[PDB]
Design a protein around this nucleic acid. Sequence first.
RNA 1: CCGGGCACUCUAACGGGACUGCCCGCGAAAGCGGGAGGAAGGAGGGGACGACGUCUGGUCAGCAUGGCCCUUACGGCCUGGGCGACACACGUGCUACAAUGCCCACUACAAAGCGAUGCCACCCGGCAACGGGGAGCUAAUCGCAAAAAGGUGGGCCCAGUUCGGAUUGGGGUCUGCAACCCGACCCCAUGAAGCCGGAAUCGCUAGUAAUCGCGGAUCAGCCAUGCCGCGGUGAAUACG
RNA 2: CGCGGGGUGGAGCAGCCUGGUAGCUCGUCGGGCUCAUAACCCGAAGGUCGUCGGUUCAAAUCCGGCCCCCGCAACCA
RNA 3: CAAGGAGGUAAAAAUGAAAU
Lengths: 155, 25, 60, 91, 206, 118
Amino acid sequence: ARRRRAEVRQLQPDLVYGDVLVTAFINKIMRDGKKNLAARIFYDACKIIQEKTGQEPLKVFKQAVENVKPRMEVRSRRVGGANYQVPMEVSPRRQQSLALRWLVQAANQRPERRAAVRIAHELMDAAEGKGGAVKKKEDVERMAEANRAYAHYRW
Amino acid sequence: GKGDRRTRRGKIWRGTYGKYRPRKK
Amino acid sequence: ARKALIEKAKRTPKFKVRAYTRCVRCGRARSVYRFFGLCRICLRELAHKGQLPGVRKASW
Amino acid sequence: GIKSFKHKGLKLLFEKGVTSGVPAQDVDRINDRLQAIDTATEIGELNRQIYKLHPLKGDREGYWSITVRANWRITFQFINGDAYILNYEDY
Amino acid sequence: GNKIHPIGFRLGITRDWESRWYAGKKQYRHLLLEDQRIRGLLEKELYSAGLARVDIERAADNVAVTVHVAKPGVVIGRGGERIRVLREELAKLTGKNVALNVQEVQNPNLSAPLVAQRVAEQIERRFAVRRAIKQAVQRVMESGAKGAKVIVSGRIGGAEQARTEWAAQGRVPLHTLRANIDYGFALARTTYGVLGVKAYIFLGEV
Amino acid sequence: ARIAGVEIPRNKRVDVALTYIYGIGKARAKEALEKTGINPATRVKDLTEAEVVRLREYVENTWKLEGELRAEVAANIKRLMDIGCYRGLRHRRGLPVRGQRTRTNARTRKGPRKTVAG
RNA sequence: CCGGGCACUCUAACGGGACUGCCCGCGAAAGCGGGAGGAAGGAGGGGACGACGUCUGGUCAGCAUGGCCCUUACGGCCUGGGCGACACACGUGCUACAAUGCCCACUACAAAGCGAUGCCACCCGGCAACGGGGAGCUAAUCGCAAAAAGGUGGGCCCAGUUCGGAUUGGGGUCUGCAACCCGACCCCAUGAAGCCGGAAUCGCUAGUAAUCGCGGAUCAGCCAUGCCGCGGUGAAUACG
RNA sequence: CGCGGGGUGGAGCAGCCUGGUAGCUCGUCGGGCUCAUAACCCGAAGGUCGUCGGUUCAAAUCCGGCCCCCGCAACCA
RNA sequence: CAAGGAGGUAAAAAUGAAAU
Ligand SMILES: [Mg+2]
Ligand SMILES: [Mg+2]
Ligand SMILES: [Mg+2]
Ligand SMILES: [Mg+2]
Ligand SMILES: [Mg+2]
Ligand SMILES: [Mg+2]
Ligand SMILES: [Mg+2]
Ligand SMILES: [Mg+2]
Ligand SMILES: [Mg+2]
Ligand SMILES: [Mg+2]
Ligand SMILES: [Mg+2]
Ligand SMILES: [Mg+2]
Ligand SMILES: [Mg+2]
Ligand SMILES: [Mg+2]
Ligand SMILES: [Zn+2]
């Protein structure tokens, strides 16, 4: 019954960058608890960003996250055996989490061969507003758009 | 290939040694 | 088959592989520790009794 | 005709006369019951007062239950003049 | 229910051992069997003494054995028998230094094994169990105890129906470690079966 | 190149291409090209015809392989035809040869499930 | 490795160490929030501990025990068989379906435990399992063990394909009186199903889930992918 | 005995006329949900088309002979 | 700043188990 509001977990800043965000992204890359392979892939992809574009990956990655941020999402709620879906706003914590999660997932959805090039490209596509994650973001906002009827149920 | 008897990895998992996994040096 | 069966367990002749462990306090053939010569059941009894030198509850 | 057993003790008493699977004082009791279930051509014959016959309910539907003694039952499926799955169990 | 043996629960701090010797492997097994056969042989022809403990100590062929008894009446002055061959019959499968001592347990009403054994005798005397429990507790409580508790379980007064008679005065905290709680148990053999008597005796600590 | 009974594997490393023959596997593979003295990491694409001839001549001879040894293997099972042993009956019933568990599993010899129900 | 030294690390024996004691705010009190205080905090993180009682719960096959029954036998010994059977159904699992992947070589970084009726260094034969030798070790001395994921290099290049390892043929080793029913490994050749799971269903809130190997018990051997432990790298999220 | 209709998985019905595909509900069998049963959800299996002949390259289907089932008709003296 | 008197009321979900 959540007596405690569960305090927000804080991370360690990365190497060379100091991000309070990049490490969170590396973590999503991480599988089976191998931060070595995870971090390597991201920094690898950072080197890949430099090639296809003359931009610093610290902004390319930053803007990509900003473009894959759900303004509002759909929430299933009350009365009628939980029949309604109230479109709710998204907390900065949750926009944060969804952005990075959808990025990595869409990144591994790509037909490319190497994990680094998937990350790099999906970030470049998302920075422009083209990524498959941006599709996911825009999709979730469609659902939230179509439910404005009983949005006044709010909460 | 943790169950293939023709790998250093499968030989680890099985425990035993052999040609695919020599007893060091 | 229990009395004549704790006989064989101490008799131990005829082929070396036909010989087997067996709790002494009981007659248990399973979970017999070589260290005490007892089954897991008896061992627990005596450990609570205090009749097992040094043997003490494990908490960590 | 009894055609299949689920209880080994019951099986041995009727087949070989091996009594070491049942209680010793219920040997005659269990015997007369089994012979009755063997001779029975329909469930209606297994209806003597001393048997307290009844079909079981729930997941045991399709089964029957005559009383040996106390809380002890012989359960089975009777079908077309034959009983199957003769079990000895608690009520 | 399910509760751990209040003796084993201590062992380390509060309540020391009962067989205090050290050995490595290849020896522990043999010496423990001998040790237990001593306890087994003693219990038989020494029950009339009512022995609270059977402490045992060793030091390479030394085997010391301390028998705690309420009333050591069965020792009778040196060559008055009841000790001579009696402490010498141990070495018929031992052959080691059968050093048998005898202790005088002062108050038997504060020795848990003795309490339970007195109760278990009364069950076999066909006594009224509930009244026997009550008295034994008060008897223990009468001899200065800080808390007591006796438990007989099963087949009380014969009669087809296993029961459990319960009585306890004062304080008996089993969960506490600094407890000094003596635990005893006894089998009452009856013509209608077997029932067990637990006895808890408690004193202060800190 | 039609090495034994097969020819299929083109541009894909001779130590690997060799594997595509019933009788070669992996150990006999590098064993054959070190004994014939050919580079394992080659193209397989019809390289030096001489290396291919030597390879073919050694491999196809030496030990039995392809359809010939399939016949021998099948004949070794036909050994336990006649009035054969227990191991033959396991080849007869279609059940596992090495006495394993057949109460469950053993689907690789029994085949897919049939389901009786009762 | 020696001389020597034992301050560091470790080893294991007793101790010191926070009790929201100190500051602000709230309150009648308990207490709650917040802050320098320090390794630590408002039961620091885990163990052992399971009230009166409940389930005619479980256990006469650990053992004890009332009653009933068996005694040239419902007891006793032996050889062999069976518990391992298989048209099927459910549970708990292990290995996978690949490229944050697999293979080969090189090179690092643990803890907790076990061993002189055994662990077996280093050589020698052997593709290997293993066999011949044979040193040290009653073991923080010697041995089991190189930890493995990791790192470096190189090779496959996305196809059931160097993924996957089932199944089967042949040849061998070791324990054992003996391994056909029914043992574990080693080597050659086969290389199946599976390309990620229907209705449903499980675990876990911080060293935690996931992933990686290591030890022990029982043990001649071993059907252990189990159980009990050990450490390595190490997430996500909790509005409510 | 005269006309008309009909025999199809276990049950009840389609498909026949415009020959090459046998389909539907229920039941059955497997698996889920539940302490359990029912309901519900998932997934399967199941038919000599009454029978004997004939036409066809091919017959549940088109054509005859019997075999049952159903419905009409059997009037004037 | 403290409430009495007034009114719309959940859903679709049925059974019972085998000597006192
Ligand atoms: Mg044993
Ligand atoms: Mg088998
Ligand atoms: Mg407590
Ligand atoms: Mg019961
Ligand atoms: Mg018994
Ligand atoms: Mg079994
Ligand atoms: Mg396939
Ligand atoms: Mg594929
Ligand atoms: Mg929790
Ligand atoms: Mg069903
Ligand atoms: Mg149901
Ligand atoms: Mg007219
Ligand atoms: Mg009804
Ligand atoms: Mg009722
Ligand atoms: Zn025992």
